[PDB]
Amino acid sequence: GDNGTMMQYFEWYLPNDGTLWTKMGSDASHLKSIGITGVWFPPAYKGQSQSDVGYGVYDMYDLGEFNQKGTVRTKYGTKAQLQSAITSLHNNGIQAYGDVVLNHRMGADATETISAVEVNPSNRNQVTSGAYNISAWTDFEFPGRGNTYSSFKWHSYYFDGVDWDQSRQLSGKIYQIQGKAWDWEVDSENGNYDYLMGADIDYDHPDVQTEVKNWGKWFVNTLNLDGVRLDAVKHIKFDYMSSWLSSVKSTTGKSNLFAVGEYWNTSLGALENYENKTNWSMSLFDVPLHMNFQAAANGGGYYDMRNLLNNTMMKNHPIQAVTFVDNHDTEPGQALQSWVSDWFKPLAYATILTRQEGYPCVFYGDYYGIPSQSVSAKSTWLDKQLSARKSYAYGTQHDYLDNQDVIGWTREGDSAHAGSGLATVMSDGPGGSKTMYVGTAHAGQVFKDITGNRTDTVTINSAGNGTFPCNGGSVSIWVKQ
Ligand SMILES: C[C@H]1O[C@H](O[C@H]2[C@H](O)[C@@H](O)[C@@H](O)O[C@@H]2CO)[C@H](O)[C@@H](O)[C@@H]1N[C@H]1C=C(CO)[C@@H](O[C@H]2O[C@H](CO)[C@@H](O[C@H]3O[C@H](C)[C@@H](N[C@H]4C=C(CO)[C@@H](O)[C@H](O)[C@H]4O)[C@H](O)[C@H]3O)[C@H](O)[C@H]2O)[C@H](O)[C@H]1O
Ligand SMILES: OC[C@H]1O[C@H](O[C@H]2[C@H](O)[C@@H](O)[C@@H](O)O[C@@H]2CO)[C@H](O)[C@@H](O)[C@@H]1O
Ligand SMILES: OC[C@H]1O[C@@H](O)[C@H](O)[C@@H](O)[C@@H]1O
Ligand SMILES: OC[C@H]1O[C@H](O)[C@H](O)[C@@H](O)[C@@H]1O
Ligand SMILES: OC[C@H]1O[C@H](O)[C@H](O)[C@@H](O)[C@@H]1O
Ligand SMILES: [Ca+2]
Ligand SMILES: [Ca+2]
Ligand SMILES: [Ca+2]
Ligand code: NA
């Protein structure tokens, strides 16, 4: 009955030095000590170059094992290093979740000359040219792997489209391969959002349907995975992704394989439509809660803190909510830049770590810092919040989201976790106090601030109430001294 806590074990700007798998393995016992129970590791297969973060997917059967793209290792290291790291996580009781990129492929071995039409980038259902022959990056043969594990080769007729004609080099185009149709259902932004980048996989094609299930089975088996992080699920045929997840569970013996999808949309309704169309079979990153954390941070005291959880997965669908403050895309300089400022970050982490709703995900970029962007490591204060979650965030919750600035909640504690119970209080503005119910069983106990932000103590009265303060623009988490 211990709380679960995920860590995203990478950030965008890590050096291309083939050390991440070695570090992850060495970190396992430390991650266990701070309460991390699952690790999301980056795309572990060969990208279009050695330095690829992993999203520019070339060969999903090359886990840093084959001489392809001028390298054996990936950015992160070798197959054997990743396997050793997962053995070390499992030796420490930590789940391993592999990033799974199924939308597209990049770094084709060869061009193919194929018939295509242009479509409106704002309305991909609208054809805007006659048919003509383009030079497309659609031929994937993987000669460096030489058919090891899989003889499957990719050609144009397994893709729906590309955004580049190597023969004409025109910018701002999207090409639909002749005879192909955008997959459905996908997100309807730009009319049909199947196409994102690269060579867009055709999930209408039955050879592709079979092959990508076969790959999924091989990947989970090969690395003995507990779960998957599914990339760009709003751009992949909804009913196929649902079928893919059922198939891998059934074939790998991983009947309860954990799945969290990235459906990047700021409106809850989009995430609810996805869950509806995939039978509520997977969790989703709580993108709306991340936007709420950004709006509060960016409001400089004037945000209404009563609204912090509104229109979120965490409030509305907590079983399926993977809550986060920042990720590799929201960090400075990246594609979804929407960074939660240092001052607010502890309030955001206290929200996801001490509440009963959601599966929180700690960002590597927050814990260990982002030196290339002058982002300080936050591990010193994160370790105290993670202690709050590991040891104290148990039992019945009472919410006091009843002030524009000062909000809080309590956990009563449960018998399985000795000394458990807490009161979280926080302000986006001036400091304040909240009288909150931690439980009559705490009557006469003295509470301290496990964050160390406050050095005063709080005595629980006989009615099970304390008056819990915080500093301005700060959080305190009150536990039994
Ligand atoms: C980053 C997220 O993008 C999408 O988000 C959209 C929203 O959906 C939309 O509503 C609105 O908010 O705009 C957003 C930004 O566009 C997407 O929905 C979401 O799933 C994405 N996060 C995921 C997905 C991916 C992709 O798998 C990850 O993306 C990251 O890695 C990308 C690939 O390296 C990188 O893309 C940039 O670089 C590539 C190289 C380039 N592609 C061209 C280049 C080549 C070969 O070099 C050829 O293949 C073609 O000519 C081109 O397609 C892109 O043009 C460029 O954008 C991306 O920056 C990076 O974020 C992401 O990490 C996941 O978490
Ligand atoms: O932390 C390991 C834990 O992860 C998953 O449990 C999730 C669950 O699926 C979600 O619905 C939500 O409540 O968060 C849980 C994590 O606390 C795995 O399914 C589970 O087996 C595993 O122990
Ligand atoms: O150092 C320059 C900037 O770095 C960003 O990542 C921060 O959020 C800013 O508040 C800061 O001013
Ligand atoms: O929003 C556009 C979508 O409308 C419909 O559902 C069509 O079946 C689909 O092919 C199309 O892309
Ligand atoms: O959303 C606008 C900007 O808001 C904040 O300043 C964020 O730190 C930055 O990442 C984002 O780009
Ligand atoms: Ca697609
Ligand atoms: Ca199609
Ligand atoms: Ca406020
Ligand atoms: Na497609």
Residue numbers in the entry: 4 to 484
Copy text verbatim from the article accompanying this structure deposition.
Here, we report the three-dimensional structure of a ‘Termamyl’-like α-amylase, the AliC α-amylase from Alicyclobacillus sp. 18711. One particularly important subset of GH13 enzymes are the ‘Termamyl’-like α-amylases, historically named after an enzyme from Bacillus licheniformis. These enzymes typically feature a three-domain ‘A, B, C’ arrangement with a C-terminal β-sheet domain and with domain B being a protrusion from the (β/α)8 fold of domain A. The catalytic centre is placed in domain A, whilst the A–B interface forms the substrate-binding cleft. The fold, as expected, is a canonical three-domain arrangement with the A, B and C domains defined approximately as A, residues 4–104 and 210–397; B, residues 105–209; and C, residues 398–484. A classical Ca2+–Na+–Ca2+ triad is found at the A/B-domain interface.
The complex of AliC with acarbose was solved by molecular replacement, with two molecules of AliC in the asymmetric unit, at a resolution of 2.1 Å. As with many (retaining) α-amylase complexes [some examples from the author’s laboratory include those reported in Brzozowski et al., Davies et al., Brzozowski & Davies, Dauter et al. and Offen et al.], the acarbose is observed as a transglycosylated species, here a hexasaccharide which contains two of the acarviosin disaccharide motifs. An initial ligand-bound structure with a transglycosyl­ated acarbose-derived oligosaccharide at a resolution of 2.1 Å revealed a noncovalently linked glucose moiety, hinting at a putative branch-accommodation site around the +2/+3 subsites. Of particular interest to us was the observation of a ‘lone’ ordered glucose moiety that was not covalently linked to the acarbose-derived oligosaccharide in a position that could be indicative of the accommodation of branch points at either the +2 or +3 positions of AliC. An additional isolated glucose molecule, modelled in both α and β anomeric forms (occupancy set at 0.5 for each and in different orientations; omitted from Fig. 1 for clarity), was observed near a potential +3 site. We speculated whether these isolated glucose moieties could provide insight into branch-point recognition. At the time of writing, structural similarity searches using PDBeFold showed that the closest three-dimensional match to AliC is the B. halmapalus α-amylase, with 67% sequence identity and with 479 aligned Cα atoms overlapping with an r.m.s.d. of 0.49 Å (PDBeFold Q score 0.95, Z-score 27.8).
